[PDB]
Paper text:
A hallmark of all motile [name] cells is the accumulation of [name]-GTP at the leading pole where it activates motility, while [name]-GDP is found diffusely in the cytosol. This localization pattern arises due to the GAP activity of [name], which is located at the lagging pole where it inactivates [name]-GTP and depletes it from this pole. The ability of [name] to hydrolyze GTP is essential for motility regulation. To gain insight into the structural landscape of [name] [name], we determined the crystal structures of [name] in different nucleotide states, which uncovered that [name] can adopt three conformations: inactive [name]-GDP, active [name]-GTPγS, whose structure had not been determined before, and an unusual conformation combining inactive and active features.
Author numbering:
A (entry chain A): 6 to 133
B (entry chain B): 8 to 133
Write the structure that this text describes.
Amino acid sequence: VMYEEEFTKINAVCDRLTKDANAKVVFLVDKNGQLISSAGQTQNIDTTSLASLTAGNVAAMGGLAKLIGENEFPNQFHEGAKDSLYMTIVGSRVVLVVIFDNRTSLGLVRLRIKKASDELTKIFESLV
Amino acid sequence: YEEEFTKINAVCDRLTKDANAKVVFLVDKNGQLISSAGQTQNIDTTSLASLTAGNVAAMGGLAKLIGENEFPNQFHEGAKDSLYMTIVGSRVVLVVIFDNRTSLGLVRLRIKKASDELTKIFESLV
């Protein structure tokens, strides 16, 4: 009953996503604010504080979606000057955060995020 | 009463029509609703303004964490309707809710024009 094995698969998805999508840093945050996984250039970034602020944003967005008679917004894109941010809700419990340089193709990051999200959904569904 | 306030509502009304938006809101970062235009009817405007402020504050801290200035434009994609948030003069938030059938490039171009018009109004307020 030890998985353990399923958590290593989660980190592998994050590591592959950072390399394939050519992302700067990748995070997996639970809606309760807990950091599940992180990959890439995690040095010089407060992972704990990032997870807490992600949860606060997603919770505010969730309540806002319900107010307009809409289901939770699955994808959130925030464009910056040098680096951009992408957020994807995986199975309405987990948030996949992807930080990448603006020079990287938006179509490329989105295509890889979809593959990562689908891989993660299958892992979280095996966790009953 | 207040010529500048009528100009603010006019920008929101023009934005709803021109960008073909469902509903448009103007929220202060402190959670106060400034203006609203469009299909405001079955939406709790006070609760929307409070949740917008909470989200913008979390997003502001998230931008600072990644060594970036506050994101001027925040996009949240849905199944039927999408949401757009634009920070006007780092004090006011312009919330635009629109159907996914509307062009993303069209909404963004109109939001920029509305934001520039609003910045000029808020700067005349001293």
